[PDB]
């Protein structure tokens with residue numbers, strides 16, 4: 092129940108971004124990192140599973 | 141054995157084909173000059189491109205890849221013929237010459253995990269790392285004996301691996317005459333060839349995660365004895381054959397497969413003169429500016445990295461005294477100031493670069509270790525990261541997390557450039573001349589402006605004196621600077637490689653102008669290409685400048701001025717103490733700048749640039 096914004100963030104996490112190498116040899120990350128801080132019993136582990 | 145062969149169509153035709161292959165008279169071929177170079181250098185083997193052979197004669201290439209031994213024999217015969225033709229005198233020294241192979245093998249490019257019995261008796265290419273090596277041992281080929289009783293000398297010829305299968309009649313050492321008179325071996329007249337054995341493992345970076353590695357065994361002949369060492373990444377091209385077991389009655393039916401190497405590879409003027417002579421100061425100006433377009437600003441750090449790339453001059457005297465010539469830098473800054481990007485770029489550009497983070501490697505894995513060999517009971521030395529990086533670069537990310545003992549160990553490398561090792565039974569002094577990059581976070585997470593840098597750095601004065609340069613980087617949130625940073629970042633993000641369709645998944649001295657990577661305003665200037673930059677860096681590193689009398693007194697007076705200004709600097713604090721190492725640092729930076737612009741002597745401008753760098757780095761508001 093709830094967390095439509097959280098679910099959309101998880102969906103765009105699953106799809107992920109695009110990685111880009113550069114002519115200098117340097118690279119830039121193409122993946123997304125998320126953090127969830129909350130009280131116990133807020134249905135966080137279930138989303139991870 | 142009196143058996144001889146009179147005719148063989150295939151062998152004769154193959155020899156004729158190789159004779160026509162290596163002519164290079166009516167063609168643009170180069171092999172003639174290669175043979176002349178071999179004669180000049182007293183070497184006795186050749187390397188021939190497989191793709192070139194396939195282009196000239198596809199059938200011969202197909203046969204050689206599918207069948208190795210006979211075709212290689214034909215190659216060696218043709219080499220003997222042409223070496224005799226060009227210069228018959230030189231061909232007398234050596235029995236037979238050898239052939240190397242090179243080029244893109246295609247399907248036969250095979251990993252140690254994917255070597256199978258399907259490739260037996262063919263020529264294969266393999267990429268791996270070296271794990272085990274053995275001592276070099278001589279092997280007898282031709283033996284000579286003398287009989288004091290009858291004053292007669294005899295000679296015996298040996299050929300073991302020349303023929304596929306050997307018999308007990310051969311490989312017998314003579315000791316007695318026909319009338320039982322003793323024979324005396326005469327080691328001077330005999331012939332020996334060297335022999336070595338190595339082991340190659342699939343690189344851990346290439347192996348599937350969580351699976352055990354697989355390895356191959358290689359035999360190195362007389363020429364390739366010293367071409368490999370343990371802990372090295374190599375590519376080996378050679379035959380893949382079975383090993384004949386010794387005589388017996390009952391056999392289980394399982395052979396041993398051994399790769400016999402033929403090629404071992406360590407995987408890796410007018411323009412320069414004109415550019416240098418015309419530009420002088422603009423040389424280092426553009427090199428500092430064009431160091432890395434992917435990184436925005438920070439001219440001082442780019443200058444310092446360029447000084448590392450060029451470096452100082454190693455000097456020695458009569459008494460055996462050694463004077464250091466390497467430079468060392470430490471960067472401290474707020475998060476997201478692209479320190480790790482700089483480290484990665486230096487790793488990519490520098491020839492010998494090794495990354496070793498804070499807790500990734502300990503004190504033992506940094507310098508070296510001593511291990512007792514169980515096979516012989518002797519003591520052996522295993523080199524660490526810093527010994528491998530002789531005359532190279534070691535990059536240390538998260539330098540603050542490193543333990544104290546590791547830094548005390550690094551002291552020996554940073555001061556003198558040597559490592560002393562000793563355990564009862566062995567002691568040695570290994571060379572470890574090297575340069576270090578280090579990036580460390582501030583203790584408080586983010587750099588505090590009000591507190592003096594000593595509290596933020598949290599490092600002792602000795603370690604600070606060990607480093608040549610200290611730099612502090614900050615993320616100032618100026619709206620216009622943020623606008624510039626956003627412009628640069630999004631320009632780099634929107635860029636796509638030319639020749640790649642949009643939406644798809646995944647040499648001139650000056651680089652061609654780009655609309656996005658450079659911008660419309662930058663049309664008045666250009667950036668230097670990476671390849672020419674590397675060539676110029678190598679040439680500059682070769683050059684040996686000399687210090688002039690004009691600048692020595694100037695630098696000494698400025699050092700005295702700084703040590704007196706120690707009392708004058710009241711409005712600002714000092715990042716690093718001023719010791720005797722500062723003067724050597726001044727001379728070193730002056731020589732590095734003199735290396736930047738190809739010349740013969742160190743001038744005043746280099747000293748001024750060095751002093752500007754020192755003044756900027758050593759004090760902060």
Ligand SMILES: Nc1ncnc2c1ncn2[C@@H]1O[C@H](COP(=O)(O)OP(=O)(O)O)[C@@H](O)[C@H]1O
Pocket residue numbers: 092093130131132133134135136137
């Ligand atoms: N909004 C909700 N809808 C459905 N089930 C829920 C909801 N909130 C909590 N739960 C139930 O409560 C439990 C929450 O435990 P858990 O997600 O492990 O908590 P946490 O992730 O904080 O450790 C889940 O098993 C889930 O079935």
Ligand SMILES: Nc1ncnc2c1ncn2[C@@H]1O[C@H](COP(=O)(O)OP(=O)(O)O)[C@@H](O)[C@H]1O
Pocket residue numbers: 119434435436437474475476477478479480481628629
């Ligand atoms: N001056 C700069 N020019 C371009 N990009 C930058 C700059 N400073 C920071 N960045 C961006 O911010 C990120 C910083 O990551 P990182 O280099 O790991 O920071 P740090 O090394 O300080 O932890 C990089 O991905 C880089 O793209």
Ligand SMILES: [Mg+2]
Pocket residue numbers: 479480
């Ligand atoms: Mg970092």
